[PDB]
Symmetry: C3
Subunit: 340 residues, 3 copies
């Protein structure tokens, strides 16, 4: 028997993150989480396209789980009988049994309890992986999230200095493969099973129809922009379970970036754009220096602007004219100019 | 008021680079640059395909700007009235206001002056970003270049040793999206606006029709091959504002490579092939050891050979038979051989 | 004349590797290898699709060559008269003459002998590169392999500690471009020349029809699963000569990963998923901690499950319930549960 204190965590919906400590003096615990599979139709773009999604806890991405190195993570995975297919879970943070996949296959009406030891620090993908062609289909239907395993001393810069965030956001990026009819319009289906054959045809050509953050084009823009303040160190965890991405904070930088996402490696400093290899999570820390709107994109700008992959930060504070200033506002080009 | 000496820089067309110092004892300056937007039809391949391009200073890529850490960069952006649309500029090297984009939107007939402080070392992309779907369209129409921010002590190897280049070249890689007609032939248009709708359809499928260096297939081959000599340390700056690339010098290596392009990080040593994440610049230093023709490619060889993405170096010097030699020239396979 | 001892190596077919030492006290040698080009029809998927392949030594990938830093590698390349086209070889490990390509062009019925000095440590791609559009076509038809140049002291972790593998496997990943007829079925051809025009059309769209390890979907699953044991440190060399990949060991990690594949750089630790930039080889060391089946994939799961890119490891040993355990097997969801 494993004789450690137990602590139940209540997950919250992305892009927010459940409460946790960075540095901790607590010893190892059995951290208890519950993920409930939900198959449901969801809206994925600004024109109202719908999609037969499959999710952990009703969101794309699934929620961010946060533990510390040496914790045991005890996950109750639930597959309600309102669902139509089997599901499971593969933690890239875990060791053995296909990440847990081989121990968590559950039919609708069932649940299972998996424990894995958090021996490896970093941010990691988790995803459903039932077997064979169902693996990609469940993942690109939305069944993926991430887990962060923090060192007990918190983050550091790989050169002996502590790093601490004031705020954390989890950006899950999702590649979607939505069939079109002969007229070029997106097709709708009454169940995931009915969508499968047509969807697999799109998947096979490896070109997503949509690339979205937090499950939908515009999810994190407008009213749902991410808030910050000048001076705050913000950790931005980015995951992509199936396909590469290249995150960029427009008007900012990555001050410290773990592109491969693993805290045993020193972060890179001062990046413009980073790279999340498909099947992983990475993380970037940035201290905001200027107020205003920032866009956070994948820097395939076609994906960002035209397929859905733009988030906004709204940053409060005072403008720093030393860092940047408009010396002269737009004006007519001088009559006496020559420019050739 | 900012009370520093001013220095006007005259830019030159890629792949060359304006004169500059590596290590410097000069203190911070206000470095003055002018970029003039030019919309124009350009030839992009060997069969004479034309393209409605949009450029900074009439080239793809735009010119390389070079400053040092702590300089202020004062850019006059000009949009002549012969142009048809609004433009702006986003410096990935800059902090705030969408990289400057939010302070530089100018209509045809206008100019604007932006100042940004060069607080971050490395090579960085700059690009136009007017807003929404115009962002990718302006970038993939050719409106992108790069800026290098050198440490005042010059480059180093991240282990306490100075690195110095004898020669520098800037390779801007451009993904292009050219519409085809029903017969499969590339379409021509009389203006960028007229090309837009058809071009956006190609863009949406994320597969370029052309991938080119210095604006055209064959730009840097033949008569325009890049020159070097045996023994020279050559810095090769590579940018890609929208899409990943994987540079490789055929017959050489990357002796010191900043793949993510930022000089606060130690370079990697002895690479065969590196990776420029879309939306960034990187840089590789190589000391030539052998004379002859080298091809410089993205190592998706289909893109390199068939879509336009090959440059040549012509290197003068003496062959080193210790490093490589043809022991036996091609000859008939021996009658008495067995090879099974 | 180069006056060193000569040692003939007998290559073996991937995923296995010819016998070699890791650390060695032997001084530099002239290591002699022979590669024989074979053009032949090969089966590439589970439905029996055939393909006009071009290979080194009859396999995709070509065999792994292993030498040490400072060795000279003397390669006899043979192009039998049963072949139909010219071939050559470009070693990314070599310096000059397009990696050897410019010194090894041989017609059917000819052979050539190239020597290159192993001055650069790591794993490296080699591939055919006859010229122009034949370069990608020969590579994506299967003419690529890898060479490993070990330090004479063996591998280390970049922080002063020796690393040693108990077992080594070479996974060559191949992107294939197989034409389809009007009904959507893969086309068959009687020679590589006859396949060329239709194949180049698929290549131009940059989307492979198949992505395979060891030359075929399912090559390294079932009876040909890779064996290991709990406690063994296994080096997994992964190459991709034309296109990016993102390797992942399902249920494991990369304990030490040289993603760019070059042993002068310290490996990254504890990766979930790594990235092989097209045109390179990388390598991951992992010590198995749990028995069972592991899948080894590229983590574009569509490519892995649906286009062919899954291998299996079968690992013997004792299960470690501390690392992972099934706390409760699948069971009906409690009548008294609430889950909303
Ligand atoms: Cu599922
Ligand atoms: Cu996975
Ligand atoms: Cu513009
Ligand atoms: Cu940008
Ligand atoms: Cu060949
Ligand atoms: Cu190559």
């Amino acid at each position: 028997d494993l004789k450690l204190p137990r602590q139940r965590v209540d997950l919250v919906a992305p892009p927010f993150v459940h409460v946790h400590e960075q540095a901790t003096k607590q010893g190892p615990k059995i951290m208890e989480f519950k993920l409930v599979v939900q198959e449901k139709k969801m809206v994925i773009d600004e024109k109202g396209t719908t999609f037969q999604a499959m999710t952990f806890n009703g969101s794309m991405p699934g929620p961010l789980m946060v533990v510390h190195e040496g914790d045991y993570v005890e996950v109750t995975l639930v597959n309600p009988a309102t669902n139509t297919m089997p599901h499971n879970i593969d933690f890239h943070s875990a060791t053995g049994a296909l990440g847990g996949g081989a121990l968590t296959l559950i039919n609708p009406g069932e649940q299972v309890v998996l424990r894995w030891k958090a021996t490896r620090t970093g941010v990691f993908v988790y995803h459903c992986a039932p077997g064979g062609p169902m693996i990609p289909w469940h993942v690109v239907s939305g069944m993926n999230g991430a887990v962060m395993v923090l060192p007990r001393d918190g983050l550091n810069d790989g050169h002996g200095h502590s790093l601490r965030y004031d705020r954390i956001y989890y950006i899950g990026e999702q590649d979607l493969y939505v069939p079109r009819d002969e007229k070029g319009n997106f097709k709708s289906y009454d169940s995931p099973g009915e969508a499968y054959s047509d969807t697999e045809e799109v998947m096979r050509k490896l070109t997503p129809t949509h690339v979205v953050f937090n499950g939908k084009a515009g999810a994190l823009t407008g009213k749902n922009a991410l808030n910050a303040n000048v001076g705050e160190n913000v950790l931005i965890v980015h995951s992509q379970a199936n396909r590469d991405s290249r995150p960029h904070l427009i008007g900012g930088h990555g001050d410290y970036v773990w592109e491969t996402g693993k805290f045993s490696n020193a972060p890179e400093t001062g990046l413009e754009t980073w790279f999340i290899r498909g099947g992983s999570a990475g993380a970037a820390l940035y201290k905001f220096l200027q107020p205003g709107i920032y866009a956070y994109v994948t820097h395939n700008l076609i994906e960002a602007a035209n397929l859905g992959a733009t988030a906004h930060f709204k940053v409060e504070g005072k403008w720093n004219d030393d860092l940047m200033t408009q010396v002269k506002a737009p004006a007519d080009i001088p009559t006496g100019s020559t420019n050739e």
